Amino acid sequence: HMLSDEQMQIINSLVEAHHKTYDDSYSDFVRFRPPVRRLSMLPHLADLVSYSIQKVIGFAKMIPGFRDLTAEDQIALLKSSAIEIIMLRSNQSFSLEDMSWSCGGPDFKYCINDVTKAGHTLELLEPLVKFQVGLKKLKLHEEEHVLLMAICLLSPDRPGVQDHVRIEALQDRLCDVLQAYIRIQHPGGRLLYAKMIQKLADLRSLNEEHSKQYRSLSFQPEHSMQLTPLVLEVFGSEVS
Amino acid sequence: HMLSDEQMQIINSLVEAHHKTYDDSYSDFVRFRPPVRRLSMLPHLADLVSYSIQKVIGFAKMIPGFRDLTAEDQIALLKSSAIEIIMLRSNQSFSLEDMSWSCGGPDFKYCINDVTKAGHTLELLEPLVKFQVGLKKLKLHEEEHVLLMAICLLSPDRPGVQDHVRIEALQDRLCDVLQAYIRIQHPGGRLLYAKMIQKLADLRSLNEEHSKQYRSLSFQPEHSMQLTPLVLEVFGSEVS
């Protein structure tokens, strides 16, 4: 029971990819439309999400085997999983102490209330926080966190995927890497893997609810005009 | 030779409209994506222009007779004239002393160089400055400035206009008001009116060049993604 010189290369890649597309100082946030605490946080959070999508795309492109999919599959996967990858990667800034995402100073500490100022219900936010708390409680190794993001992105059960035999293959190889990594490198991690797969299940429902909330926003031009072309294109139903 | 109780009501309306849609403190600019001095000013200037378009729409809706046009005509006029109304209204912030638009502090003082950081050529900017200098030299009364904006918007010679017999009527009434106002209220203004109409001619060419520059930008997704949904819709060729 020892990782193969191919399983660790996959791990090397995903971890470097994450480092290349995730800044722990959050210094680009000053370039977003500033936060205001009628849907005052919408501009800021739309910018955040748009930016994060760009980052998720950069990451996805570095997932072993992703570049080889058809552009359609790459798109079909990004569109379906974008919000979930975003929810996953945000855990890095999320804080149990204050139950908010802490991206620096008074301005970039996002709490439940801030997101409601962006067209979301206090009600719909409960699960997201709960999910962040459960995910944070797992205390994932960077290897696992980064692996979980890649596995999520390569879910075959996404509307629009064509070659779902091949995405299933890439994801299984990834799942294997993670199971092996946990068994070999993660003491006390006997039941961790399954808790992680459970998280993917939680992501699907969170994705579902968001999609609904987002439709409501995107249908009112006064609100939709606050979005970005990227956000509108990624969360839009335009089908190709 | 004395203005009619109807010509002054038109003047009252356009002047109040301008006051309602133009802030001389420029305090909303802090809500734009901040300026950076690869096309670093694009985000800021796109936000500025998007905001200004919103303001131009607010103004247009208060131009006597504009609300009565078909929604198509209103749109056809806004789309064609938007950039020109913007160029006209900016003269208020433009400064002969420094040949820049001065909207407050180091951050919001826009010079020729800043606009080039937004995908425009130093070459294409020459006329805009020249135009601002000529327009500023006219030292227009607020009544005239505001009148000139309304006349520009109701130009009948715009792609897409349907009822160009009726826009011509509204614009002529406006032109009359301005000619009368100048004759009666503007000492030393014998030759001013014609210089103002000449400015409309200058706007057409400036509109033309911008449209070209804008096409170049809007065709590169990496640049187009920096625009706003409003800008993209107003300067887009989508035809209806």
Partner: peptide, 10 residues
Amino acid sequence: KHKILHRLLQ
């Protein structure tokens, strides 16, 4: 048509 996504995907 996904102009931007296709662009960003290199």
